[PDB]
Amino acid sequence: EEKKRLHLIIADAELETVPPEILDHPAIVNYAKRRKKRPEKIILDSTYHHAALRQLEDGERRGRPDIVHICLLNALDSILNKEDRLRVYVHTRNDYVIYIKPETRLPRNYNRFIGLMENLFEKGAVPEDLELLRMEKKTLNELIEEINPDVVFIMHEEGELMIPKNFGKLLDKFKKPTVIVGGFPHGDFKSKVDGVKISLYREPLMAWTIVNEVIVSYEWEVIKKF
Amino acid sequence: EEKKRLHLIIADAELETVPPEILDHPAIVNYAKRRKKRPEKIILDSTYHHAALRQLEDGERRGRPDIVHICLLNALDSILNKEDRLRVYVHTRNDYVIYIKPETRLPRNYNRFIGLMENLFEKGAVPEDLELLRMEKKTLNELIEEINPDVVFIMHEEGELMIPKNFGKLLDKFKKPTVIVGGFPHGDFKSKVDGVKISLYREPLMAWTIVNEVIVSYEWEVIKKF
Ligand SMILES: Nc1ncnc2c1ncn2[C@@H]1O[C@H](CO)[C@@H](O)[C@H]1O
Ligand SMILES: Nc1ncnc2c1ncn2[C@@H]1O[C@H](CO)[C@@H](O)[C@H]1O
Ligand SMILES: O=S([O-])[O-]
Ligand SMILES: O=S([O-])[O-]
Numbered sequence: 001e002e003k004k005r006l007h008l009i010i011a012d013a014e015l016e017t018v019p020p021e022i023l024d025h026p027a028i029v030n031y032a033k034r035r036k037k038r039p040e041k042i043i044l045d046s047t048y049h050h051a052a053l054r055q056l057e058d059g060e061r062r063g064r065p066d067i068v069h070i071c072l073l074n075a076l077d078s079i080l081n082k083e084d085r086l087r088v089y090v091h092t093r094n095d096y097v098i099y100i101k102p103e104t105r106l107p108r109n110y111n112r113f114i115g116l117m118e119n120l121f122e123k124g125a126v127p128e129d130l131e132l133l134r135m136e137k138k139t140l141n142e143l144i145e146e147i148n149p150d151v152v153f154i155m156h157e158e159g160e161l162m163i164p165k166n167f168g169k170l171l172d173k174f175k176k177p178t179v180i181v182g183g184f185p186h187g188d189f190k191s192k193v194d195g196v197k198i199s200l201y202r203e204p205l206m207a208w209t210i211v212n213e214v215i216v217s218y219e220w221e222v223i224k225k226f
Numbered sequence: 227e228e229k230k231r232l233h234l235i236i237a238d239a240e241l242e243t244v245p246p247e248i249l250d251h252p253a254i255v256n257y258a259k260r261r262k263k264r265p266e267k268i269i270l271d272s273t274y275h276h277a278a279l280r281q282l283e284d285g286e287r288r289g290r291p292d293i294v295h296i297c298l299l300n301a302l303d304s305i306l307n308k309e310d311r312l313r314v315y316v317h318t319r320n321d322y323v324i325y326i327k328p329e330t331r332l333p334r335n336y337n338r339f340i341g342l343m344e345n346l347f348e349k350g351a352v353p354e355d356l357e358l359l360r361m362e363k364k365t366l367n368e369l370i371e372e373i374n375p376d377v378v379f380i381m382h383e384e385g386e387l388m389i390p391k392n393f394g395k396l397l398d399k400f401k402k403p404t405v406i407v408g409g410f411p412h413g414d415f416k417s418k419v420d421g422v423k424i425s426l427y428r429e430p431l432m433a434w435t436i437v438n439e440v441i442v443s444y445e446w447e448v449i450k451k452f
């Protein structure tokens with residue numbers, strides 16, 4: 001825990017159980033009936049639950065646990081992760097953080113991932129002994145305080161434009177760089193924290209693409225055998 | 227169609243409708259009843275269908291359409307794709323090929339992706355006019371013949387070890403390099419074609435990780451503004 005590592009936060013993520021406001025919406029009730037599950041225990045998924053989101057605040061961007069899934073598959077299966085050069089976290093839109101042990105094997109199947117998220121939200125930590133995933137009430141600033149990095153970067157389409165290769169070289173100049181990528185499909189961050197905004201392209205990209213550019217660019221600097 | 231581009235083939239992919247042999251397996255019948263769908267029309271998914279795979283040849287590696295989904299999300303959302311430097315194809319374990327127009331927006335949600343695959347397998351091309359996805363009976367060699375590349379690389383854990391950065395530099399020395407990545411979770415390729423085997427790491431990696439390493443490494447060579 002003294003070697004250089006990237007601390008990557010997928011932040012303001014659209015990962016939540018079904019909003020209390022819409023628990024009785026027919027599309028929710030029908031879905032939960034079919035799944036034989038209590039609605040309040042179910043992970044919100046706009047693919048199934050869109051009809052119920054029409055009237056919800058930010059309804060159009062909520063319920064995107066797919067973004068976290070694909071980001072985490074990309075991050076945890078990375079060479080950077082295997083070389084013990086990555087720590088990854090999820091901060092959700094409702095100010096919960098998920099801590100992930102680096103050795104975690106995330107379900108490749110999305111539906112199995114959702115099942116895992118349902119278990120995590122219910123029990124607070126999974127599995128019982130290992131606690132490969134652990135969740136608690138926490139703001140993005142509180143998380144950053146815990147990491148105590150020497151620099152915070154916020155990946156932002158409007159930030160300082162950098163060639164991805166060059167951003168990797170920049171990250172390798174720090175001991176404990178934190179990079180924040182939004183876990184939401186469009187719009188602004190909800191959590192304004194101090195950090196350096198960095199663009200890698202002058203068009204919007206998906207979170208997983210940004211994850212890949214950052215991780216791969218860093219890999220080729222920080223792993224001396226590369 | 228004269229600029230350098232990477233032609234990326236996700237090959238021998240575990241993407242198929244339910245095997246004829248197991249259509250009457252209870253786990254298949256129950257699943258298809260629940261989905262109100264004809265079993266033969268359903269995409270095989272080991273997450274739901276594993277009980278029926280126990281006795282099938284290669285049962286343990288079949289029904290992994292998740293691998294294709296995550297590979298294609300990674301490929302199509304890439305900067306390389308946006309710069310018109312990528313052509314991507316799927317060749318399946320049953321000798322079908324899927325051609326993908328570069329502008330295709332793949333469903334981010336896995337279950338919506340499966341629905342799209344069901345439609346594609348049924349109709350041969352989707353959507354009706356656009357034909358962003360098109361499928362036909364075809365071997366991997368026949369596909370390579372169509373591409374007519376100046377080099378074929380086969381990403382293989384046992385191949386010539388290369389630093390990913392350096393493989394990108396190598397790819398940029400060709401006009402029309404084809405790269406093959408297996409779309410199967412473990413084991414050997416089924417389709418032996420002529421090509422140069424390249425390892426990027428001396429441990430096994432998932433297909434999507436290899437996809438990211440290849441695409442990102444190439445990007446930083448082939449896109450002159452990088
Ligand atoms: N062009 C871009 N450069 C850098 N980060 C980006 C870009 N497009 C999107 N992102 C990041 O991905 C998230 C999801 O699109 C955004 O909240 C942001 O963190
Ligand atoms: N270490 C590796 N180097 C290169 N390609 C690999 C490696 N591990 C797996 N692959 C590729 O990913 C596919 C799925 O693991 C394999 O069939 C192969 O194409
Ligand atoms: O059955 S309820 O606890 O999901
Ligand atoms: O990893 S499991 O979801 O196939």
Ligand SMILES: O=S([O-])[O-]
Pocket residue numbers: 262263264267
């Ligand atoms: O209803 S059957 O055609 O899937």
Ligand SMILES: O=S([O-])[O-]
Pocket residue numbers: 047332333334335336338339
């Ligand atoms: O892109 S759709 O699957 O959310």
Ligand SMILES: [Cl-]
Pocket residue numbers: 015016017094
């Ligand atoms: Cl929540």
Ligand SMILES: [Cl-]
Pocket residue numbers: 241242243320
């Ligand atoms: Cl098939």
